Design a protein around this motif. Structure first.
Motif, PDB file in Angstrom:
ATOM      1  N   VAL A   2       0.825  -1.202   0.000  1.00 34.98           N
ATOM      2  CA  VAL A   2       0.000   0.000   0.000  1.00 34.98           C
ATOM      3  C   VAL A   2       0.863   1.258   0.000  1.00 34.98           C
ATOM      4  O   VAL A   2       0.524   2.255  -0.638  1.00 34.98           O
ATOM      5  N   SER A   3       1.982   1.202   0.716  1.00 33.77           N
ATOM      6  CA  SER A   3       2.894   2.337   0.796  1.00 33.77           C
ATOM      7  C   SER A   3       3.418   2.707  -0.588  1.00 33.77           C
ATOM      8  O   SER A   3       3.676   3.877  -0.873  1.00 33.77           O
ATOM      9  N   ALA A   4       3.572   1.703  -1.443  1.00 33.28           N
ATOM     10  CA  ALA A   4       4.063   1.920  -2.799  1.00 33.28           C
ATOM     11  C   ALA A   4       2.982   1.609  -3.830  1.00 33.28           C
ATOM     12  O   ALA A   4       3.281   1.236  -4.964  1.00 33.28           O
ATOM     13  N   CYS A   5       1.724   1.765  -3.429  1.00 29.67           N
ATOM     14  CA  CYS A   5       0.597   1.502  -4.317  1.00 29.67           C
ATOM     15  C   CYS A   5       0.680   2.368  -5.570  1.00 29.67           C
ATOM     16  O   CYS A   5       1.096   3.526  -5.512  1.00 29.67           O
ATOM     17  N   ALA A   6       0.274   1.801  -6.701  1.00 34.00           N
ATOM     18  CA  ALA A   6       0.292   2.518  -7.968  1.00 34.00           C
ATOM     19  C   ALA A   6      -1.098   3.036  -8.319  1.00 34.00           C
ATOM     20  O   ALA A   6      -1.239   4.040  -9.017  1.00 34.00           O
ATOM     21  N   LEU A   7      -2.123   2.345  -7.831  1.00 34.98           N
ATOM     22  CA  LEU A   7      -3.503   2.735  -8.091  1.00 34.98           C
ATOM     23  C   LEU A   7      -3.857   4.016  -7.337  1.00 34.98           C
ATOM     24  O   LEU A   7      -3.172   4.392  -6.385  1.00 34.98           O
ATOM     25  N   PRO A   8      -4.934   4.704  -7.753  1.00 32.68           N
ATOM     26  CA  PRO A   8      -5.374   5.947  -7.111  1.00 32.68           C
ATOM     27  C   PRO A   8      -5.881   5.717  -5.690  1.00 32.68           C
ATOM     28  O   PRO A   8      -7.068   5.887  -5.408  1.00 32.68           O
ATOM     29  N   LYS A   9      -4.974   5.333  -4.798  1.00 35.29           N
ATOM     30  CA  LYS A   9      -5.326   5.081  -3.406  1.00 35.29           C
ATOM     31  C   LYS A   9      -6.313   3.925  -3.289  1.00 35.29           C
ATOM     32  O   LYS A   9      -7.397   3.959  -3.874  1.00 35.29           O
ATOM     33  N   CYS A  10      -5.933   2.904  -2.528  1.00 32.55           N
ATOM     34  CA  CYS A  10      -6.787   1.736  -2.330  1.00 32.55           C
ATOM     35  C   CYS A  10      -7.106   1.545  -0.852  1.00 32.55           C
ATOM     36  O   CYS A  10      -8.270   1.545  -0.451  1.00 32.55           O
ATOM     37  N   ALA A  11      -6.062   1.378  -0.046  1.00 36.92           N
ATOM     38  CA  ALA A  11      -6.225   1.180   1.390  1.00 36.92           C
ATOM     39  C   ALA A  11      -7.008   2.328   2.020  1.00 36.92           C
ATOM     40  O   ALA A  11      -6.457   3.397   2.286  1.00 36.92           O
TER      41      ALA A  11
END
Ligand code: ZN
Length: 25
Positions: A2-11
């Motif tokens: 999650v810290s390096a997530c590529a999507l427009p914010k997930c968590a």
């Protein structure tokens, strides 16, 4: 992760699982 997530914010509650479920691929 999650810290390096590529999507427009997930968590939306500090949950990597809910994120990695689609991201990290
Ligand atoms: Zn993500």
């Amino acid at each position: 992760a999650v810290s390096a997530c590529a999507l427009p914010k997930c968590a939306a509650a500090a949950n990597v699982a809910a994120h990695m479920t689609h991201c990290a691929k």
